[PDB]
Write a protein that binds this DNA or RNA. Structure first.
Lengths: 272, 44, 93
RNA sequence: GAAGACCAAGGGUUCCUGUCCAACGUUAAUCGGGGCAGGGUAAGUCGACCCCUAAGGCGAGGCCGAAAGGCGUAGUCGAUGGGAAACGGGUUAAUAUUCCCGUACUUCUUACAAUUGCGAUGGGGGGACGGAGAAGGCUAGGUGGGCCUGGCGACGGUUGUCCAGGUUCAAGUGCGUAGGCUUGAGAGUUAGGUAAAUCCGGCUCUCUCUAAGGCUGAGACACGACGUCGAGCACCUACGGGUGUGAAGUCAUUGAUGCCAUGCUUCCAGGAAAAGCCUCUAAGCUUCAGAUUGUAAGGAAUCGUACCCCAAACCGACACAGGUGGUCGGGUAGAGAAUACCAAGGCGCUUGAGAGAACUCGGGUGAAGGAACUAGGCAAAAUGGUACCGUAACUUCGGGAGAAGGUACGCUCUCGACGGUGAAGUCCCUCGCGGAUGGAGCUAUUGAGAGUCGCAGAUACCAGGUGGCUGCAACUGUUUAUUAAAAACACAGCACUGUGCAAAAUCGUAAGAUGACGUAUACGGUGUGACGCCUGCCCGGUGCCGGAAGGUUAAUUGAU
């Protein structure tokens, strides 16, 4: 739920919190945790390759079944859990054979619910069929681009794709971008939308809250010196003195940067 | 006031030590250079 | 298995000292200057064989050598390993 | 709450003793961190080494690269983290959890005995962990009583309800308490844990399910300890000692920031890893080898150990008003680790002696006035506590607010009201580290009244000046190390835009990386900058996006 914090301090005044009562208060399921050190946006060269990343809380990576290939065997949602490694929540499912796993927790799914994968799987939330076995019009998430590879599209909190058409060995999906693209029908997708849609209604309220999420501050180009940024320089506030560019001179405000060509055949309509 | 030399032995060795010099081509160049100069101390 | 050659190299000299004298008088401990390589086991063997005594304990330390100036040229004296060898009660060396 | 005592680092003999005083030492020096010589550092248990891993490093093959090399797999290194075990006392000129005394604990090897499926690089478990808050239980330590020993007063008084000092001891073992966690028991079974599994996970049946079993566990108590310590005396002088022998050794209260507690509650930002360890089997071995439990015998190496550490020994050229991580923290007062005065302990800061000019520095007071000073109240002065009373505009309803401004405040007595702890005795016991029950003793809080001294009772130290109008920036933050701390940066929020995942983007020749083990509620760039009301007109220019008809146009081709 969405809760506005009472202004007992500046720093609290404009906080809006997503508080989910259904999330498990205890410790996560230890067999599915891995270490997840932070890199501060530095690469193997040790250089900052991505700006404005640094700090935040230590958190373990939870291992999610994005593949969902354990067909036939039903699984019951033991609990929903907070996953620090993503916006969505994760469900801990128990298979009838006593395997436990984490899945991306779909919208209306709660402890006790049964999920199943495979071609026979009923068309209900959390179930994973091959998209050829999923009726046209249906909303799905955790969509595979390559069969067997595991879900890659529609995994963010509140995300989902809709199957728009089916022609041959491809289905056309509409992604949250608005892009329409062909995907191989053999690829799996899970029925329904990812949960935690209220994620977008949060309001951090204060500087430090961003810092808790491991985001360092962004300095604007216009307040740097010309040696530092094409928008640097000037006496008094300026607008950059030029068409907006990145730190590396690349045109921002409109300039398209997609250059794939390999994958253009799969894109039916662009998001625009 | 905190001055620039804040010695630790380990950091001295790992940076300027013999095994550090010997690990890299350019480090070995330094050792050879110092050995040619006649330097009593090749490494720190 | 300590050889006799080893046994004859381990103990370098007795150590003469107010402290050594006290040790001998009070705690039945003979202080030797032992070889740097010497181990407490080798030292016990050597003391037993070469003095026909029964050793209770061997404690060893290394004294690091003093730097000395000697006019212009500074230089260090050599490190000495000493062994405090406690003889069993009744035994004299 | 250090100018004391320790430790790490860093240094490296500066340590202790004798001797010397040239130089060094801001003077002299008999002294010294100086010179010279001699001595001094004792470990199964501390630390290193070692086993284990983090970031990260290196990296067989590999991938990539003119060469040099770069990246990286298997690996192997890498603590700042995980992993066995020792305390009390005594002793040196100088070490001591290391020597000695007392009394422990850990682990390994070998041999032997009795039981006996053993076996991992694999499975499962465990190890194993966040921030904040709170209540409770303890203990150290403090204080007082009692006790023991001594005292009976340099000047009135001081045989007392008087004075002073003391009133010691741990690990460990036993025990299993306050507290914490967890239902157990027995059957039958198996879509799982890369194979296997008797282990784990799952399922089914019964039974039990505030419970009572297990696990954990401060502290208490017993032992350790008829030892040790102990004021005091005895006792040798060499005048330093040495040995010798030694009283009481309890109770109450208070009480940690230490312990139970890696707990409990709660929150979001969701909280190392790996090994040791337990268990399970596999391949493999089955008079074996191994395993377990026990009993002997033996081992546990090596390296560090001096000394300095709010520093004259480290970093600052100096015996430099600076810097330097961690631990310990007594009394009175006090909320307190503030502050004042003291303890333990340590120092008087390595030039002194005079004098009592100007002027400089740091302070104290000041007639009358009171900002007239000045760029500017700069600096000073002032305010300063607690309890209660009382408090405006405005407001985002939190604030503003300690607004403002008042009153009381010492000490003595009297009458009161109360909290904690909990003795004896009593009574139940499911008889113990158990319950009531009881109030002695101890200790704390507080009200009212009366009185009394002084210029003054928050008496010192300590300790907000306040209010009004207005610009700017929402706010806490950040910055020009060393002339700028701000209105500058950031910021939450907003918007545009890129980006469909082999994402964009960035580092890189490449491989490979980050992005992200993320996936459009995401990620990157750009601007704006909480919040409220809003955000007009112009697409000519220049961007960017789209469109392609035509025109122009490269390599190429090669007609003439």
């Amino acid at each position: 739920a969405i809760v506005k914090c009472k202004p007992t301090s500046p720093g609290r005044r404009h906080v809006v919190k997503v508080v989910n009562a259904d999330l498990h208060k205890g410790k996560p399921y230890a067999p599915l945790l891995e270490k997840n050190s932070k890199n501060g946006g530095r690469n193997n060269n040790g250089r900052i390759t991505v700006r404005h990343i640094g700090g935040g809380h230590k958190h373990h990576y939870r291992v999610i079944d994005f593949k969902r290939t354990k067909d036939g065997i039903p699984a019951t949602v033991e609990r929903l859990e907070y996953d620090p490694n993503r916006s969505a929540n994760i469900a801990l499912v128990l298979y009838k054979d006593g395997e436990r796993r984490y899945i991306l927790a779909p919208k209306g799914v709660v402890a006790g619910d049964v999920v199943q994968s495979g071609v026979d799987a009923p068309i209900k939330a959390g179930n994973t069929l091959p998209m050829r076995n999923i009726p046209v019009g249906s909303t799905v998430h955790n969509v595979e681009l390559k069969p067997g590879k595991g879900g890659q599209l529609a995994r963010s909190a509140g995300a989902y794709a809709q199957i728009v058409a089916r022609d041959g060995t491809y289905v056309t999906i509409r992604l949250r971008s608005g892009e329409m693209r062909k995907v191989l029908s053999e690829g799996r997708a899970t029925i329904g939308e990812v949960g935690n849609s209220e994620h977008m209604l949060r309001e951090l309220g204060k500087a430090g809250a961003t810092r808790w999420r491991g985001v360092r501050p962004t300095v604007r180009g216009v307040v740097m010196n010309p040696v530092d940024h094409p928008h640097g320089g000037g006496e008094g506030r300026t607008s950059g003195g030029r068409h907006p560019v990145s730190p590396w001179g690349m045109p921002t405000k409109g300039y398209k940067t997609r250059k794939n060509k390999r994958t253009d055949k799969y894109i039916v309509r662009r998001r625009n | 006031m905190k001055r620039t030399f804040q010695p630790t032995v380990l950091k001295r060795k790992r940076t300027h030590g013999f095994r550090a010099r010997m690990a890299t081509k350019n480090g070995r160049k330094v050792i050879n250079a110092r050995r040619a100069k006649g330097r009593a101390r090749l490494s720190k | 298995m300590i050889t006799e050659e080893r046994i004859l190299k381990v103990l370098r000299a007795p150590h003469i000292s107010e402290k050594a004298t006290m040790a001998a008088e009070k705690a039945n401990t003979i202080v030797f200057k032992v070889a740097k390589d010497a181990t407490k086991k080798e030292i016990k063997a050597a003391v037993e064989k070469l003095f026909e005594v029964e050793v209770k304990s061997v404690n060893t330390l290394i004294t690091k050598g003093k730097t000395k100036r000697q006019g212009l040229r500074q230089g260090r004296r050599s490190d000495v390993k000493k062994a405090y060898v406690t003889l069993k009660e009744g035994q004299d060396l």
